[PDB]
Amino acid sequence: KQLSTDAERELANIWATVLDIPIGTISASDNFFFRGGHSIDAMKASALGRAAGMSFGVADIFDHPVLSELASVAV
Amino acid sequence: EPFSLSPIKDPQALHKELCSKNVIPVTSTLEDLLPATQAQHVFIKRGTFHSYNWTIKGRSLNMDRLRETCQSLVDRHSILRTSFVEHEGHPIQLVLANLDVKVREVQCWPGEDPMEVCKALWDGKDWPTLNVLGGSLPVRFTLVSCPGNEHVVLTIQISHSQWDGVSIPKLFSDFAAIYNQTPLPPTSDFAHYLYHRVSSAREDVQQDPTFQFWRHYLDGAKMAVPFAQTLWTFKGIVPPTLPSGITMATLVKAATALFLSYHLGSRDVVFGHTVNGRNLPMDNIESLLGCTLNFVPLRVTFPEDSTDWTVMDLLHHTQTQYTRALSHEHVELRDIFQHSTNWPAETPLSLIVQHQNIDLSFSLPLRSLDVQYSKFARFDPLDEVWIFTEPHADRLEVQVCANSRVLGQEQATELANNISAIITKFSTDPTARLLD
Numbered sequence A: 001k002q003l004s005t006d007a008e009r010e011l012a013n014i015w016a017t018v019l020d021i022p023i024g025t026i027s028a029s030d031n032f033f034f035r036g037g038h039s040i041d042a043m044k045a046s047a048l049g050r051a052a053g054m055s056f057g058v059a060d061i062f063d064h065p066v067l068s069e070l071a072s073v074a075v
Numbered sequence B: 001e002p003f004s005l006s007p008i009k010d011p012q013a014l015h016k017e018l019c020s021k022n023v024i025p026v027t028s029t030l031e032d033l034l035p036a037t038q039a040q041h042v043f044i045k046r047g048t049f050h051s052y053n054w055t056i057k058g059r060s061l062n063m064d065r066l067r068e069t070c071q072s073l074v075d076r077h078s079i080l081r082t083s084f085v086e087h088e089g090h091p092i093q094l095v096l097a098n099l100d101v102k103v104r105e106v107q108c109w110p111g112e113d114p115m116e117v118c119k120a121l122w123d124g125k126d127w128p129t130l131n132v133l134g135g136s137l138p139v140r141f142t143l144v145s146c147p148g149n150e151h152v153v154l155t156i157q158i159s160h161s162q163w164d165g166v167s168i169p170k171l172f173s174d175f176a177a178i179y180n181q182t183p184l185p186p187t188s189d190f191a192h193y194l195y196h197r198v199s200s201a202r203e204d205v206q207q208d209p210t211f212q213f214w215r216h217y218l219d220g221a222k223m224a225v226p227f228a229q230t231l232w233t234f235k236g237i238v239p240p241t242l243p244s245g246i247t248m249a250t251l252v253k254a255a256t257a258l259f260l261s262y263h264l265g266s267r268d269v270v271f272g273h274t275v276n277g278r279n280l281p282m283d284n285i286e287s288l289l290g291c292t293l294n295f296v297p298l299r300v301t302f303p304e305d306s307t308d309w310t311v312m313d314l315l316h317h318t319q320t321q322y323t324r325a326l327s328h329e330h331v332e333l334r335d336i337f338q339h340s341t342n343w344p345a346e347t348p349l350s351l352i353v354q355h356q357n358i359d360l361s362f363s364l365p366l367r368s369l370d371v372q373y374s375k376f377a378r379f380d381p382l383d384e385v386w387i388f389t390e391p392h393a394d395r396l397e398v399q400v401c402a403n404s405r406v407l408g409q410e411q412a413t414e415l416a417n418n419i420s421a422i423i424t425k426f427s428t429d430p431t432a433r434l435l436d
Protein backbone atom coordinates (compact mmCIF):
# COMPACT_ATOMS: atom_id res chain seq x y z
CA LYS A 1 0.00 0.00 0.00
CA GLN A 2 1.56 3.28 -1.34
CA LEU A 3 2.45 6.39 0.67
CA SER A 4 0.04 9.07 -0.40
CA THR A 5 0.55 12.21 1.82
CA ASP A 6 3.59 14.25 2.81
CA ALA A 7 3.03 13.35 6.44
CA GLU A 8 3.05 9.62 5.50
CA ARG A 9 6.35 10.07 3.71
CA GLU A 10 8.05 11.96 6.49
CA LEU A 11 6.79 9.42 9.03
CA ALA A 12 8.02 6.49 6.99
CA ASN A 13 11.46 7.98 6.89
CA ILE A 14 11.34 8.32 10.64
CA TRP A 15 10.31 4.68 11.08
CA ALA A 16 13.07 3.63 8.73
CA THR A 17 15.75 5.35 10.81
CA VAL A 18 14.37 4.30 14.18
CA LEU A 19 13.65 0.69 13.31
CA ASP A 20 16.75 0.38 11.01
CA ILE A 21 14.64 -1.02 8.20
CA PRO A 22 14.82 0.12 4.57
CA ILE A 23 12.44 2.87 3.49
CA GLY A 24 11.26 0.94 0.42
CA THR A 25 9.66 -1.75 2.64
CA ILE A 26 7.35 0.57 4.48
CA SER A 27 3.70 0.73 3.48
CA ALA A 28 0.99 3.00 4.78
CA SER A 29 -0.78 0.03 6.43
CA ASP A 30 2.31 -1.01 8.42
CA ASN A 31 2.00 -1.35 12.18
CA PHE A 32 4.84 0.13 14.25
CA PHE A 33 4.91 -2.73 16.77
CA PHE A 34 4.55 -5.50 14.21
CA ARG A 35 7.63 -4.10 12.41
CA GLY A 36 9.55 -4.49 15.73
CA GLY A 37 9.09 -1.20 17.56
CA HIS A 38 8.69 -0.82 21.30
CA SER A 39 8.18 2.04 23.78
CA ILE A 40 11.74 3.36 23.48
CA ASP A 41 11.66 3.35 19.70
CA ALA A 42 8.39 5.23 19.97
CA MET A 43 10.05 7.84 22.14
CA LYS A 44 12.78 8.29 19.50
CA ALA A 45 10.24 8.42 16.68
CA SER A 46 8.33 11.11 18.49
CA ALA A 47 11.51 13.18 18.96
CA LEU A 48 12.50 12.83 15.31
CA GLY A 49 8.92 13.82 14.46
CA ARG A 50 9.41 17.11 16.24
CA ALA A 51 12.67 17.83 14.42
CA ALA A 52 10.80 17.32 11.13
CA GLY A 53 7.96 19.63 12.19
CA MET A 54 5.41 16.93 13.03
CA SER A 55 3.97 16.65 16.47
CA PHE A 56 2.92 13.41 18.13
CA GLY A 57 3.81 11.71 21.36
CA VAL A 58 4.41 8.16 22.40
CA ALA A 59 0.74 7.72 23.41
CA ASP A 60 -0.34 8.56 19.86
CA ILE A 61 1.79 5.71 18.58
CA PHE A 62 0.13 3.23 21.01
CA ASP A 63 -3.39 4.56 20.06
CA HIS A 64 -2.66 4.75 16.33
CA PRO A 65 -0.09 2.06 15.59
CA VAL A 66 -0.75 2.05 11.83
CA LEU A 67 1.31 4.52 9.81
CA SER A 68 -1.50 6.15 7.84
CA GLU A 69 -3.58 6.61 11.01
CA LEU A 70 -0.68 8.10 12.91
CA ALA A 71 0.01 10.53 10.06
CA SER A 72 -3.51 12.01 10.39
CA VAL A 73 -3.33 12.76 14.08
CA ALA A 74 0.11 14.38 13.84
CA VAL A 75 -0.13 18.25 13.80
CA GLU B 1 18.66 31.70 32.10
CA PRO B 2 21.50 30.04 34.21
CA PHE B 3 21.11 30.01 37.99
CA SER B 4 17.36 30.65 37.67
CA LEU B 5 16.60 27.38 39.52
CA SER B 6 19.37 27.75 42.07
CA PRO B 7 18.05 27.21 45.61
CA ILE B 8 21.05 29.21 46.93
CA LYS B 9 21.52 32.98 46.93
CA ASP B 10 25.34 33.27 46.09
CA PRO B 11 26.10 30.23 43.95
CA GLN B 12 29.57 31.61 43.09
CA ALA B 13 30.54 31.70 46.77
CA LEU B 14 29.82 27.96 47.05
CA HIS B 15 32.11 27.24 44.17
CA LYS B 16 34.86 29.39 45.66
CA GLU B 17 34.52 27.54 48.99
CA LEU B 18 34.86 24.14 47.25
CA CYS B 19 37.93 25.31 45.36
CA SER B 20 39.60 26.50 48.55
CA LYS B 21 39.09 23.06 50.19
CA ASN B 22 40.65 21.42 47.10
CA VAL B 23 37.53 19.41 46.30
CA ILE B 24 37.28 20.69 42.72
CA PRO B 25 39.91 22.33 40.52
CA VAL B 26 40.84 25.94 41.32
CA THR B 27 40.86 26.99 37.65
CA SER B 28 37.29 25.76 37.04
CA THR B 29 34.35 28.15 36.74
CA LEU B 30 30.74 27.75 37.74
CA GLU B 31 28.50 27.56 34.65
CA ASP B 32 25.26 26.71 36.47
CA LEU B 33 23.75 25.40 39.69
CA LEU B 34 20.50 23.40 39.92
CA PRO B 35 18.62 21.06 42.27
CA ALA B 36 19.37 17.39 41.85
CA THR B 37 16.32 15.32 40.91
CA GLN B 38 14.77 12.74 43.22
CA ALA B 39 15.82 10.02 40.79
CA GLN B 40 19.44 11.25 40.74
CA HIS B 41 19.25 11.16 44.54
CA VAL B 42 17.85 7.59 44.61
CA PHE B 43 20.98 6.47 42.84
CA ILE B 44 23.36 8.57 44.89
CA LYS B 45 21.92 7.22 48.19
CA ARG B 46 22.41 3.64 46.97
CA GLY B 47 26.04 4.14 46.04
CA THR B 48 25.27 3.48 42.37
CA PHE B 49 28.62 3.74 40.64
CA HIS B 50 30.10 2.16 37.57
CA SER B 51 33.42 1.62 35.86
CA TYR B 52 33.05 1.11 32.12
CA ASN B 53 36.20 -0.62 30.95
CA TRP B 54 37.51 -0.86 27.39
CA THR B 55 40.38 -3.24 26.69
CA ILE B 56 42.14 -1.98 23.56
CA LYS B 57 44.71 -4.14 21.66
CA GLY B 58 46.76 -3.26 18.57
CA ARG B 59 49.88 -1.46 17.36
CA SER B 60 48.22 1.68 15.99
CA LEU B 61 46.78 2.89 19.32
CA ASN B 62 47.45 6.54 19.99
CA MET B 63 47.73 7.44 23.65
CA ASP B 64 47.76 11.20 23.24
CA ARG B 65 44.60 11.02 21.22
CA LEU B 66 42.91 8.90 23.90
CA ARG B 67 43.80 11.51 26.50
CA GLU B 68 42.52 14.37 24.38
CA THR B 69 39.33 12.47 23.65
CA CYS B 70 38.57 12.25 27.38
CA GLN B 71 38.98 16.01 27.62
CA SER B 72 36.76 16.69 24.60
CA LEU B 73 34.06 14.31 25.77
CA VAL B 74 33.76 16.19 29.05
CA ASP B 75 33.72 19.56 27.20
CA ARG B 76 30.80 18.33 25.12
CA HIS B 77 28.51 16.93 27.92
CA SER B 78 27.96 19.11 30.94
CA ILE B 79 26.61 16.33 33.15
CA LEU B 80 30.10 14.87 32.95
CA ARG B 81 31.52 18.00 34.58
CA THR B 82 28.92 18.21 37.29
CA SER B 83 29.68 17.97 40.99
CA PHE B 84 27.05 17.08 43.63
CA VAL B 85 26.66 18.50 47.11
CA GLU B 86 24.10 18.93 49.90
CA HIS B 87 22.56 22.22 50.99
CA GLU B 88 20.08 22.25 53.88
CA GLY B 89 19.79 18.46 53.56
CA HIS B 90 18.96 18.73 49.81
CA PRO B 91 21.18 17.67 46.94
CA ILE B 92 22.26 20.18 44.29
CA GLN B 93 24.41 19.97 41.17
CA LEU B 94 27.19 22.37 40.26
CA VAL B 95 27.96 22.46 36.57
CA LEU B 96 31.58 23.37 36.02
CA ALA B 97 33.29 24.84 32.94
CA ASN B 98 36.97 25.46 32.09
CA LEU B 99 37.50 22.01 33.54
CA ASP B 100 40.82 20.30 32.82
CA VAL B 101 40.53 16.53 32.77
CA LYS B 102 43.46 14.66 34.31
CA VAL B 103 43.75 11.04 33.46
CA ARG B 104 45.00 8.64 36.12
CA GLU B 105 47.74 6.61 34.38
CA VAL B 106 49.41 3.33 35.22
CA GLN B 107 52.43 1.85 33.42
CA CYS B 108 52.43 -1.78 34.45
CA TRP B 109 55.26 -4.22 35.03
CA PRO B 110 56.03 -6.67 32.25
CA GLY B 111 53.63 -9.59 32.45
CA GLU B 112 51.16 -7.68 34.68
CA ASP B 113 47.50 -7.86 33.47
CA PRO B 114 46.12 -4.32 33.10
CA MET B 115 42.62 -5.44 34.01
CA GLU B 116 43.77 -6.96 37.33
CA VAL B 117 45.28 -3.57 38.18
CA CYS B 118 41.91 -1.82 37.46
CA LYS B 119 40.06 -4.39 39.54
CA ALA B 120 42.52 -3.86 42.43
CA LEU B 121 42.05 -0.09 42.34
CA TRP B 122 38.30 -0.50 42.11
CA ASP B 123 37.96 -2.80 45.13
CA GLY B 124 40.79 -1.30 47.10
CA LYS B 125 39.80 2.33 47.05
CA ASP B 126 37.69 3.65 44.18
CA TRP B 127 34.25 2.44 45.49
CA PRO B 128 34.92 1.94 49.18
CA THR B 129 35.93 5.62 49.58
CA LEU B 130 33.28 6.98 47.23
CA ASN B 131 31.55 10.04 48.58
CA VAL B 132 29.59 11.65 45.77
CA LEU B 133 27.90 14.20 48.03
CA GLY B 134 31.30 15.56 49.16
CA GLY B 135 31.43 17.42 45.83
CA SER B 136 34.35 15.70 44.14
CA LEU B 137 33.64 15.02 40.44
CA PRO B 138 32.37 11.49 39.99
CA VAL B 139 33.39 11.29 36.32
CA ARG B 140 37.08 10.30 36.06
CA PHE B 141 39.25 8.46 33.61
CA THR B 142 41.99 5.88 34.07
CA LEU B 143 44.41 4.54 31.48
CA VAL B 144 46.35 1.36 32.32
CA SER B 145 49.05 0.24 29.85
CA CYS B 146 51.41 -2.67 29.33
CA PRO B 147 54.89 -1.69 28.24
CA GLY B 148 54.74 -1.09 24.46
CA ASN B 149 51.22 0.45 24.63
CA GLU B 150 49.69 -2.30 22.49
CA HIS B 151 47.46 -3.58 25.27
CA VAL B 152 45.68 -0.84 27.22
CA VAL B 153 42.66 -0.61 29.46
CA LEU B 154 40.68 2.59 29.44
CA THR B 155 38.24 3.20 32.26
CA ILE B 156 35.41 5.71 32.77
CA GLN B 157 33.98 5.93 36.25
CA ILE B 158 30.60 7.51 36.66
CA SER B 159 27.66 7.90 39.05
CA HIS B 160 24.25 6.67 37.87
CA SER B 161 22.95 10.14 38.57
CA GLN B 162 24.78 11.06 35.36
CA TRP B 163 23.49 8.55 32.82
CA ASP B 164 20.70 6.26 31.82
CA GLY B 165 20.11 3.37 29.45
CA VAL B 166 18.89 5.44 26.57
CA SER B 167 21.84 7.84 26.64
CA ILE B 168 24.89 5.82 27.81
CA PRO B 169 25.46 4.42 24.24
CA LYS B 170 25.84 7.97 23.09
CA LEU B 171 28.67 8.50 25.51
CA PHE B 172 30.54 5.58 23.84
CA SER B 173 29.65 6.50 20.25
CA ASP B 174 30.67 10.14 20.92
CA PHE B 175 33.97 8.98 22.39
CA ALA B 176 34.68 6.89 19.32
CA ALA B 177 33.76 9.69 16.91
CA ILE B 178 35.99 12.17 18.72
CA TYR B 179 38.90 9.70 18.77
CA ASN B 180 38.36 8.90 15.10
CA GLN B 181 37.96 12.61 14.25
CA THR B 182 34.42 12.00 12.81
CA PRO B 183 31.94 14.94 12.99
CA LEU B 184 29.24 15.18 15.66
CA PRO B 185 25.89 17.01 15.68
CA PRO B 186 25.27 19.51 18.48
CA THR B 187 23.42 18.26 21.53
CA SER B 188 21.75 19.52 24.74
CA ASP B 189 22.64 18.82 28.28
CA PHE B 190 20.84 17.57 31.33
CA ALA B 191 20.38 21.11 32.66
CA HIS B 192 18.24 21.95 29.61
CA TYR B 193 16.01 18.99 30.53
CA LEU B 194 15.46 20.41 34.02
CA TYR B 195 14.66 23.90 32.69
CA HIS B 196 12.23 22.41 30.21
CA ARG B 197 10.31 20.46 32.90
CA VAL B 198 9.87 23.57 34.99
CA SER B 199 8.66 25.72 32.09
CA SER B 200 5.84 23.23 31.40
CA ALA B 201 4.60 23.23 35.02
CA ARG B 202 1.79 25.60 35.99
CA GLU B 203 2.31 28.05 38.80
CA ASP B 204 -0.97 26.93 40.53
CA VAL B 205 -0.45 23.28 41.27
CA GLN B 206 -4.17 22.48 41.61
CA GLN B 207 -4.63 23.68 38.00
CA ASP B 208 -1.83 21.45 36.61
CA PRO B 209 -3.32 18.71 34.40
CA THR B 210 -0.49 16.44 35.57
CA PHE B 211 -1.39 16.56 39.26
CA GLN B 212 -5.07 16.35 38.32
CA PHE B 213 -4.24 13.22 36.34
CA TRP B 214 -2.35 11.58 39.22
CA ARG B 215 -5.15 12.47 41.68
CA HIS B 216 -7.70 10.69 39.61
CA TYR B 217 -5.30 7.85 38.70
CA LEU B 218 -4.53 7.05 42.35
CA ASP B 219 -7.95 7.85 43.84
CA GLY B 220 -8.87 5.25 46.45
CA ALA B 221 -5.63 3.39 45.94
CA LYS B 222 -3.42 1.94 48.59
CA MET B 223 0.26 1.19 48.19
CA ALA B 224 1.11 -1.94 50.05
CA VAL B 225 4.55 -3.07 51.07
CA PRO B 226 4.95 -6.65 49.83
CA PHE B 227 8.28 -7.27 51.63
CA ALA B 228 9.73 -6.11 55.08
CA GLN B 229 23.98 -7.62 52.32
CA THR B 230 22.75 -6.92 48.70
CA LEU B 231 21.62 -10.07 46.77
CA TRP B 232 21.03 -10.69 43.10
CA THR B 233 18.99 -13.64 41.94
CA PHE B 234 18.57 -14.66 38.25
CA LYS B 235 16.16 -16.79 36.28
CA GLY B 236 16.09 -17.33 32.50
CA ILE B 237 13.13 -18.42 30.36
CA VAL B 238 12.54 -18.89 26.65
CA PRO B 239 11.71 -15.53 25.08
CA PRO B 240 7.94 -15.10 25.33
CA THR B 241 5.80 -14.77 22.22
CA LEU B 242 3.96 -11.47 22.28
CA PRO B 243 0.21 -11.35 21.88
CA SER B 244 -0.90 -8.99 19.17
CA GLY B 245 -0.60 -5.35 20.22
CA ILE B 246 1.20 -6.05 23.54
CA THR B 247 4.77 -5.06 24.42
CA MET B 248 7.15 -7.20 26.43
CA ALA B 249 7.19 -4.62 29.19
CA THR B 250 3.43 -4.94 29.54
CA LEU B 251 3.75 -8.71 29.83
CA VAL B 252 6.30 -8.43 32.62
CA LYS B 253 4.26 -5.85 34.53
CA ALA B 254 1.01 -7.82 34.23
CA ALA B 255 2.77 -10.89 35.55
CA THR B 256 4.07 -8.91 38.47
CA ALA B 257 0.59 -7.52 39.15
CA LEU B 258 -1.01 -10.97 39.11
CA PHE B 259 1.65 -12.18 41.49
CA LEU B 260 1.12 -9.31 43.89
CA SER B 261 -2.62 -9.73 43.67
CA TYR B 262 -2.22 -13.17 45.17
CA HIS B 263 0.69 -12.43 47.50
CA LEU B 264 -1.20 -9.61 49.11
CA GLY B 265 -4.94 -10.36 49.22
CA SER B 266 -5.87 -7.64 46.88
CA ARG B 267 -7.55 -6.87 43.66
CA ASP B 268 -6.14 -3.36 43.56
CA VAL B 269 -2.34 -3.14 43.49
CA VAL B 270 0.10 -0.30 43.21
CA PHE B 271 3.80 -0.74 42.69
CA GLY B 272 6.63 1.25 41.17
CA HIS B 273 8.11 1.06 37.72
CA THR B 274 10.89 2.73 35.78
CA VAL B 275 10.06 5.02 32.92
CA ASN B 276 12.47 6.76 30.60
CA GLY B 277 11.28 10.31 31.15
CA ARG B 278 11.94 11.41 27.58
CA ASN B 279 8.38 11.82 26.22
CA LEU B 280 8.65 15.61 26.18
CA PRO B 281 8.65 18.04 23.28
CA MET B 282 12.22 19.33 23.67
CA ASP B 283 15.06 19.39 21.17
CA ASN B 284 17.49 16.48 21.42
CA ILE B 285 15.62 14.87 24.22
CA GLU B 286 16.36 11.42 22.75
CA SER B 287 20.13 11.88 22.80
CA LEU B 288 21.09 14.16 25.68
CA LEU B 289 23.35 12.64 28.29
CA GLY B 290 21.93 12.33 31.79
CA CYS B 291 19.61 10.49 34.09
CA THR B 292 16.09 11.36 32.96
CA LEU B 293 14.72 8.07 34.42
CA ASN B 294 11.82 8.22 36.76
CA PHE B 295 10.27 5.75 39.21
CA VAL B 296 6.51 6.20 39.28
CA PRO B 297 3.35 4.43 40.46
CA LEU B 298 1.69 1.84 38.30
CA ARG B 299 -1.79 0.75 39.33
CA VAL B 300 -3.46 -2.48 38.23
CA THR B 301 -7.04 -3.06 39.30
CA PHE B 302 -8.63 -6.49 38.84
CA PRO B 303 -12.45 -6.46 38.78
CA GLU B 304 -14.26 -7.57 41.97
CA ASP B 305 -15.78 -10.35 39.91
CA SER B 306 -12.93 -11.37 37.55
CA THR B 307 -14.54 -14.70 36.64
CA ASP B 308 -14.46 -13.80 32.94
CA TRP B 309 -11.20 -11.80 32.70
CA THR B 310 -8.73 -13.39 30.36
CA VAL B 311 -4.99 -12.89 30.28
CA MET B 312 -5.61 -10.57 27.30
CA ASP B 313 -7.95 -8.44 29.35
CA LEU B 314 -5.25 -8.07 31.96
CA LEU B 315 -2.59 -7.26 29.36
CA HIS B 316 -4.70 -4.54 27.69
CA HIS B 317 -5.59 -3.07 31.05
CA THR B 318 -1.96 -3.06 32.24
CA GLN B 319 -0.74 -1.49 29.04
CA THR B 320 -3.40 1.24 29.19
CA GLN B 321 -2.43 1.98 32.81
CA TYR B 322 1.03 2.81 31.49
CA THR B 323 0.02 4.73 28.41
CA ARG B 324 -2.47 6.89 30.37
CA ALA B 325 0.51 8.26 32.32
CA LEU B 326 2.81 9.02 29.32
CA SER B 327 2.24 12.73 29.37
CA HIS B 328 2.66 12.92 33.15
CA GLU B 329 5.47 10.45 33.98
CA HIS B 330 8.19 13.08 34.17
CA VAL B 331 7.37 14.84 37.46
CA GLU B 332 9.02 14.23 40.83
CA LEU B 333 7.47 11.37 42.75
CA ARG B 334 7.34 13.39 46.00
CA ASP B 335 5.34 16.04 44.09
CA ILE B 336 2.90 13.37 42.93
CA PHE B 337 2.40 12.14 46.47
CA GLN B 338 2.22 15.69 47.99
CA HIS B 339 -0.15 17.28 45.46
CA SER B 340 -2.24 14.29 44.33
CA THR B 341 -2.62 12.07 47.41
CA ASN B 342 -3.12 12.08 51.18
CA TRP B 343 0.06 10.00 51.43
CA PRO B 344 3.24 11.41 53.06
CA ALA B 345 5.45 13.01 50.42
CA GLU B 346 8.51 10.94 51.30
CA THR B 347 6.63 7.68 51.02
CA PRO B 348 9.05 5.25 49.31
CA LEU B 349 8.23 2.79 46.57
CA SER B 350 8.79 -0.69 47.96
CA LEU B 351 8.72 -2.65 44.71
CA ILE B 352 10.09 -1.40 41.39
CA VAL B 353 9.94 -3.19 38.04
CA GLN B 354 12.41 -2.16 35.28
CA HIS B 355 12.08 -3.59 31.94
CA GLN B 356 15.39 -3.17 30.07
CA ASN B 357 14.36 -2.48 26.49
CA ILE B 358 17.52 -0.53 25.85
CA ASP B 359 20.99 -1.50 24.49
CA LEU B 360 22.46 -4.41 26.40
CA SER B 361 25.75 -4.70 24.47
CA PHE B 362 28.13 -1.85 23.70
CA SER B 363 30.84 -0.93 21.24
CA LEU B 364 33.65 1.52 20.91
CA PRO B 365 34.71 1.23 17.24
CA LEU B 366 38.10 2.97 17.42
CA ARG B 367 40.11 3.01 14.09
CA SER B 368 43.25 -1.97 13.23
CA LEU B 369 42.09 -2.07 16.92
CA ASP B 370 40.45 -4.83 18.87
CA VAL B 371 38.20 -3.31 21.56
CA GLN B 372 36.35 -5.30 24.26
CA TYR B 373 33.81 -4.12 26.81
CA SER B 374 33.45 -5.02 30.48
CA LYS B 375 32.32 -3.22 33.62
CA PHE B 376 32.39 -3.02 37.38
CA ALA B 377 29.30 -1.96 39.25
CA ARG B 378 28.00 -1.07 42.69
CA PHE B 379 24.35 -0.82 43.50
CA ASP B 380 22.87 -1.31 47.02
CA PRO B 381 19.13 -1.08 47.58
CA LEU B 382 17.62 0.24 50.82
CA ASP B 383 14.23 -1.31 51.79
CA GLU B 384 12.82 -1.64 48.27
CA VAL B 385 12.87 -4.69 46.03
CA TRP B 386 13.92 -4.33 42.34
CA ILE B 387 12.83 -6.64 39.57
CA PHE B 388 14.79 -6.18 36.33
CA THR B 389 13.94 -8.00 33.11
CA GLU B 390 16.52 -8.28 30.34
CA PRO B 391 15.38 -9.32 26.91
CA HIS B 392 18.27 -11.17 25.21
CA ALA B 393 18.19 -13.02 21.91
CA ASP B 394 18.12 -16.48 23.49
CA ARG B 395 16.30 -15.73 26.76
CA LEU B 396 14.30 -13.30 28.87
CA GLU B 397 16.18 -12.91 32.10
CA VAL B 398 14.38 -12.02 35.32
CA GLN B 399 16.62 -10.48 37.98
CA VAL B 400 15.67 -9.73 41.56
CA CYS B 401 17.80 -7.39 43.57
CA ALA B 402 17.21 -6.62 47.21
CA ASN B 403 18.91 -6.48 50.55
CA SER B 404 18.94 -9.94 52.32
CA ARG B 405 17.19 -8.46 55.37
CA VAL B 406 14.22 -7.69 53.08
CA LEU B 407 14.28 -10.70 50.87
CA GLY B 408 16.39 -13.72 51.78
CA GLN B 409 17.84 -16.01 49.16
CA GLU B 410 15.07 -18.60 49.24
CA GLN B 411 12.37 -16.02 49.13
CA ALA B 412 14.11 -14.22 46.21
CA THR B 413 14.54 -17.47 44.33
CA GLU B 414 10.87 -18.21 44.70
CA LEU B 415 9.87 -14.69 43.59
CA ALA B 416 11.99 -15.00 40.41
CA ASN B 417 10.48 -18.40 39.72
CA ASN B 418 6.89 -17.30 40.15
CA ILE B 419 7.21 -14.17 37.96
CA SER B 420 8.96 -16.26 35.30
CA ALA B 421 6.33 -18.99 35.39
CA ILE B 422 3.49 -16.50 35.05
CA ILE B 423 5.18 -14.74 32.13
CA THR B 424 5.51 -18.10 30.29
CA LYS B 425 1.95 -19.13 31.07
CA PHE B 426 0.63 -15.80 29.75
CA SER B 427 2.71 -16.24 26.61
CA THR B 428 1.66 -19.81 25.79
CA ASP B 429 -2.06 -19.12 26.36
CA PRO B 430 -3.23 -15.48 26.20
CA THR B 431 -6.92 -16.47 25.65
CA ALA B 432 -6.99 -18.36 28.99
CA ARG B 433 -9.00 -16.98 31.89
CA LEU B 434 -7.14 -15.89 35.00
CA LEU B 435 -8.32 -19.04 36.83
CA ASP B 436 -5.30 -20.72 35.17
Ligand SMILES: *P(=O)(O)OCC(C)(C)[C@@H](O)C(=O)NCCC(=O)NCCS
Residues within 6 Å of the ligand: A038, A039, A040, B164, B165, B166, B247, B248, B249, B250, B274, B275, B276, B277, B293, B354, B355, B356, B357, B358
Ligand atom coordinates in the same frame (compact mmCIF):
# COMPACT_ATOMS: atom_id res chain seq x y z
P1 LIG C 1 7.23 -0.47 26.28
O1 LIG C 1 5.87 -0.89 26.66
O2 LIG C 1 7.92 -1.30 25.23
O3 LIG C 1 8.25 0.00 27.47
C1 LIG C 1 7.94 0.57 28.73
C2 LIG C 1 9.20 0.97 29.62
C3 LIG C 1 8.27 1.82 30.51
C4 LIG C 1 9.47 -0.46 29.96
C5 LIG C 1 10.14 1.68 28.59
O4 LIG C 1 9.37 2.75 27.90
C6 LIG C 1 11.15 2.43 29.44
O5 LIG C 1 10.91 3.57 29.86
N1 LIG C 1 12.28 2.14 30.01
C7 LIG C 1 13.11 1.02 30.05
C8 LIG C 1 14.56 1.45 29.88
C9 LIG C 1 15.32 1.89 31.10
O6 LIG C 1 15.11 2.99 31.55
N2 LIG C 1 16.27 1.06 31.55
C10 LIG C 1 17.10 1.31 32.70
C11 LIG C 1 18.01 2.48 32.50
S1 LIG C 1 19.64 2.13 33.21
